[PDB]
Amino acid sequence: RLPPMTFFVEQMSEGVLKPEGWATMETVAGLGEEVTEDEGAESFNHVYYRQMYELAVAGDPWAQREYAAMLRAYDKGCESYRASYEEADVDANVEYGVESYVVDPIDFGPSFDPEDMYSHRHAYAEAADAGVTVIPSQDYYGPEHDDPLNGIVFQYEAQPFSRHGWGGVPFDLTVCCEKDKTSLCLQGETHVSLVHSVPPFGPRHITQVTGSWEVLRPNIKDVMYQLEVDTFKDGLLGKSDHAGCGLMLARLGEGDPRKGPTAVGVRLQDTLRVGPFKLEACASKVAVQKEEGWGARAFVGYDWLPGLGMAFDFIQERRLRGYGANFTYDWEALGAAFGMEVDYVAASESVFVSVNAFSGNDYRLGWLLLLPAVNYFKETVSSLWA
Amino acid sequence: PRLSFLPIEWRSIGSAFGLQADVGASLKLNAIGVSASNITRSSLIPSLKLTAAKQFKRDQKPELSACWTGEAGADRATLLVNVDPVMRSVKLAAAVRTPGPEWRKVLYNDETDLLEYPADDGARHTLYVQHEVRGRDLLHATRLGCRLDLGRLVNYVVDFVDYRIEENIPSFVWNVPLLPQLYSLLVPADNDEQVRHRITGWELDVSHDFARSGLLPVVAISKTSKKLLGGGTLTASYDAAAREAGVSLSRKGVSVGARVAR
């Protein structure tokens, strides 16, 4: 039925999460002048222009004038984009003739079958830059003599309900469809962002609604539905605390999206500088209905040693408990970049150490290492010969 | 109250020299007289303490009565200390007479180019505090009363609710219908440096001593109006322990008591 509570706990305590914000047309941002990128200025402009409009609905002169200037810049910018598109169209006609531009094929790596044997089907005329973006989906094991591309992934992003490029609701939809004679894999995910207040007109409060549905017909005769609602306010218990809360509800509905097992969980996140230690911690608890699971993560940074990286993670299930510690360090030596990662798992009393070295010149590693590995292989083969 | 503050017939005589209720019979010079204890049947009987000799040039069981009297500005402070060595018991009474905190604020008039001070002085300007000690390890009787006019107290609270609290209060509360009108009635807008509410002549006396009772305060509201029959204090007292209502009409030191004890 519903996946192990361990999956839900891990998904909840991903880490500190920053939600998506508004998008600015940029033609009206400087009223037709060069502008830099600031999150505060963009947010303020969307609310300011909406507020000035609201006031200009009533007979306030200064408001009416400020809104009028925005409209003039908005009309000028739009017409300029229209003219540029009309021109670029004609210039492209001359550059390529009546023949349309053809896109590049998709690389699939070495195969015993002739290279680019089927490249003709992966080259097509470029579309007229529609809203949706199409990405092909492949499989680990393809057919013996055919391309392994089954189905497509479609992504759409927008910001509807904006009056003049100001305001609206950040939106996002992503659907993957793989219809086949025996398979119907439809997996979907949607995100909506609501902004309540902005730093100049008050606190910065944002809310994210996420809804994901997964259905596979040949394997499961049921659809898994999941919803999540999160609220993040900057500076709940500090100047810039960035603390946030969230709720998650997943039901494996039979289709009947009503009668199904239901897993419900809650999460919270918080950042805090104490002395020389910066901390980013996220905790979460989920119950299935009954299994109860607890999970938290904690990234700790030390000012005196910036290079050292410290992550801690603990999971408790009910009775059963387990935690792990990961440390990371990087340096350079012998004209080569080194990175050492040390992971400790207390539940199994095992220590793992992993070092990765990259050299751009001199092959120094080959002389300084890998001499024992060759020796043992030679001895093994030589012993077999004996 | 102030009558209770100095009920001693000897200390009252000492004050005169420095210059149902029976006055103390005291004659003094350069302190001493007799204990004329007040009695509220057909006749009345006074007490008699032979050791009434009191001498404070610098201002049974023998006694040492020393009185400390210092008054600065609008604040007046009297301390009456009696010490009996054989008894090993000390009776100390300290009273304070100060207006206390003021809602009024100093204002600057640009045209005058001088500060305008709230020179106006509340008539009471008195916050009586009463606290006597029996003299044993744990014997004390405190009868402090809000001498400060009830109106003077109401103004300080209303000024606090206006300037400091209203800004903090959220708007969804103001969304409630008819609430802003009631708030406006409750909190009038300040005019000049004058009070928002002009309540005067109303006083609040509470009598409650921890040794005397665990939880029985006597609530006494006093109205002192000159217009009513050419003056006269109408005090209503509610004693919870005796279930007694003490309606009183004291004018020019008259003693009255419509005891309603049940």
């Binding site: 409060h205 609220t231 709940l236 109860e292 | -």
Partner: peptide, 24 residues
């Protein structure tokens, strides 16, 4: 219990609604 403590922490972070307009 750990469950109760986590639920209480979730209730505490629910103060965002109190910080914003509440009981419209």
């Amino acid at each position: 219990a750990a469950a109760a403590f986590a639920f209480f922490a979730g209730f505490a972070f629910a103060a965002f609604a109190a910080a914003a307009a509440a009981a419209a």
